[PDB]
Amino acid sequence: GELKVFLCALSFVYFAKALAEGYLKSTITQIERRFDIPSSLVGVIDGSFEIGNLLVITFVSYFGAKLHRPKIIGAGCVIMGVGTLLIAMPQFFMEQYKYERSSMWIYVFLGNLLRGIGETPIQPLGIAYLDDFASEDNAAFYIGCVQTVAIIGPIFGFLLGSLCAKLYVDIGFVNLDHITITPKDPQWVGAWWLGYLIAGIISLLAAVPFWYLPKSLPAKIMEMARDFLPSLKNLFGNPVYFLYLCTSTVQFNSLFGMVTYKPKYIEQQYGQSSSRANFVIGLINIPAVALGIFSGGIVMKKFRISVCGAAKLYLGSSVFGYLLFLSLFALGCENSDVAGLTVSYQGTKPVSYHERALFSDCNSRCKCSETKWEPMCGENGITYVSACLAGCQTSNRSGKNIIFYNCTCVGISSGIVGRCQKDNGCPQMFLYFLVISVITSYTLSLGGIPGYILLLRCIKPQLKSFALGIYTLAIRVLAGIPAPVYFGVLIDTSCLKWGFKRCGSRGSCRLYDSNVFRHIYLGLTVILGTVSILLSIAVLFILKKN
Ligand SMILES: CC(C)CCC[C@@H](C)[C@H]1CC[C@H]2[C@@H]3CC=C4C[C@@H](OC(=O)CCC(=O)O)CC[C@]4(C)[C@H]3CC[C@]12C
Numbered sequence: 001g002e003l004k005v006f007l008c009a010l011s012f013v014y015f016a017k018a019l020a021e022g023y024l025k026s027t028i029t030q031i032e033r034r035f036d037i038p039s040s041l042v043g044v045i046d047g048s049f050e051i052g053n054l055l056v057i058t059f060v061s062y063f064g065a066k067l068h069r070p071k072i073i074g075a076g077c078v079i080m081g082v083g084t085l086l087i088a089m090p091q092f093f094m095e096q097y098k099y100e101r102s103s104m105w106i107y108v109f110l111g112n113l114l115r116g117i118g119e120t121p122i123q124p125l126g127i128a129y130l131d132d133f134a135s136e137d138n139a140a141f142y143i144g145c146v147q148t149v150a151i152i153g154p155i156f157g158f159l160l161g162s163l164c165a166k167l168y169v170d171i172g173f174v175n176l177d178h179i180t181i182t183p184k185d186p187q188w189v190g191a192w193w194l195g196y197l198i199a200g201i202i203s204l205l206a207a208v209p210f211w212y213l214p215k216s217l218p219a220k221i222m223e224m225a226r227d228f229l230p231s232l233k234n235l236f237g238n239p240v241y242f243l244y245l246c247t248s249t250v251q252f253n254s255l256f257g258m259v260t261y262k263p264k265y266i267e268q269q270y271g272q273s274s275s276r277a278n279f280v281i282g283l284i285n286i287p288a289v290a291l292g293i294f295s296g297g298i299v300m301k302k303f304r305i306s307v308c309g310a311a312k313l314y315l316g317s318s319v320f321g322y323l324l325f326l327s328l329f330a331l332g333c334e335n336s337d338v339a340g341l342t343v344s345y346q347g348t349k350p351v352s353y354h355e356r357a358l359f360s361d362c363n364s365r366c367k368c369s370e371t372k373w374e375p376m377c378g379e380n381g382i383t384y385v386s387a388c389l390a391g392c393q394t395s396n397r398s399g400k401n402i403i404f405y406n407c408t409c410v411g412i413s414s415g416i417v418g419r420c421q422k423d424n425g426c427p428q429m430f431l432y433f434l435v436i437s438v439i440t441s442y443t444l445s446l447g448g449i450p451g452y453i454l455l456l457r458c459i460k461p462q463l464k465s466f467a468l469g470i471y472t473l474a475i476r477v478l479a480g481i482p483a484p485v486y487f488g489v490l491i492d493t494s495c496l497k498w499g500f501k502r503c504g505s506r507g508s509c510r511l512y513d514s515n516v517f518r519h520i521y522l523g524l525t526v527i528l529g530t531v532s533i534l535l536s537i538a539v540l541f542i543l544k545k546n
């Protein structure tokens with residue numbers, strides 16, 4: 001009936017917003033390159049969405065509750081689509097991309113800001129509506145379906161990003177027969193704008209069903225303004241709601257931190273390429289998370305689980321997920337031998353901080369750059385920071401490979417390009433890591449829908465959307481924003497070799513200490529998870545008491 005139609009429309013809106021998010025994440029680097037803006041303005045573009053979302057989420061979730069919720073959702077979709085289309089606008093006004101053979105970025109800012117605004121009503125009003133009119137058993141399953149869509153959607157955004165990056169930026173504007181560069185060329189820019197047009201159109205189409213959906217299923221603003229403060233105290237005077245908010249905030253501090261640096265952990269700890277890390281996370285781990293969320297919804301529906309049972313399932317999923325995550329401490333690889341950083345040039349195992357001599361006797365004759373990181377794998381099994389630092393004098397191109405010779409440090413003499421592959425059982429450790437991380441992701445996500453149901457049922461019904469708004473504001477502000485920052489700071493304390501930008505400032509870290517990285521990355525996650533587990537126990541105790 002009308003409830004099923006609303007569920008389908010909300011699922012399509014979730015898909016549209018997720019696809020836009022994925023495409024934006026895939027193309028932000030191309031946008032930075034095309035517009036010739038510094039990384040600070042790139043972070044500003046990425047953060048305009050969040051400014052827009054956080055500034056109006058509370059107002060929308062509170063006042064929109066008594067209004068026509070389907071129509072507010074449709075208006076939000078329209079604003080989302082307009083903002084998405086605004087990002088592609090500068091393509092139609094800037095000059096042709098000239099490659100070696102400026103103020104239009106504000107639009108990219110403004111459009112993203114509109115996206116942040118247009119997303120705000122979708123979750124608080126959409127879920128509350130779903131919870132108001134579905135039967136008690138079916139609500140959890142419907143919410144699970146919607147959240148599964150939200151989890152899976154960005155993969156399509158990244159696929160569209162790749163497809164549009166395969167096309168030239170000035171396609172349709174310029175004859176392509178006069179262009180001598182290929183996607184492999186570093187000067188190539190893809191059709192970044194095309195995906196924004198597609199996503200904006202999809203978002204505008206997503207708004208259409210919400211103008212035919214009813215407000216309810218089987219002066220006032222000034223009066224809501226007066227009751228705003230009493231309603232806030234009602235939500236935060238509620239102990240189950242407040243403690244579940246704290247529990248979720250701490251658990252998401254753990255989870256955002258773990259997820260953000262999981263690709264880098266895979267690449268650094270297990271010697272995998274960035275592409276392989278992204279493939280295993282996006283194509284294996286994310287489906288496991290989606291399956292966990294959906295199965296939590298299924299379990300809530302099938303066994304008619306109550307609020308107390310939902311709290312128990314949330315606690316159990318957290319407990320067993322973090323216990324499984326503990327086993328990752330034993331799946332560790334040792335540091336690869338890097339001359340001067342992890343080992344000395346004589347092949348002696350780990351020197352200390354006070355012994356990091358990028359220059360040695362075997363490379364004193366050569367004037368090599370310290371800041372440059374062009375690692376090569378020598379025949380001796382020791383990785384060197386650069387071929388110059390090994391005294392390599394001749395280089396020959398054999399097929400797709402480049403081989404150095406007469407490398408004095410190696411002979412204490414050939415070397416190929418890249419880091420030496422990790423040999424002693426590290427691929428097996430990485431396979432175990434993959435299996436355990438997939439299982440852990442599924443197990444942790446198995447409690448996602450139960451906690452959501454706990455939040456929705458612990459409060460008086462008329463506050464649902466408002467509570468959902470506040471929850472969303474909390475997770476974003478107290479977990480989503482801060483956790484990547486301080487996780488990054490603590491992890492970067494394990495850096496052995498800093499990359500340097502053209503201005504002399506530090507760039508991305510090139511070599512980490514594997515043991516310190518593993519300890520920090522896993523321990524911070526587990527400690528936050530343990531705090532969350534204790535808070536969840538408190539939530540369960542109060543639920544039993546009341
Ligand atoms: C927490 C934040 C900071 C990052 C969240 C990680 C994931 C949600 C995202 C980030 C990078 C994304 C991946 C990077 C790009 C790709 C390639 C993309 O297209 C391809 O398969 C490559 C095509 C080609 O070979 O050219 C498929 C999805 C995937 C794995 C993405 C899936 C979703 C990922 C893992």
Ligand SMILES: N[C@@H](Cc1cc(I)c(Oc2cc(I)c(O)c(I)c2)c(I)c1)C(=O)O
Pocket residue numbers: 151255256259262281285286289440441442444445480
């Ligand atoms: N920009 C996105 C980034 C993001 C996506 C997912 I999906 C996610 O959820 C999980 C949970 C577990 I457990 C995992 O192992 C993995 I991988 C992802 C988290 I946290 C963050 C967002 O913030 O929504």
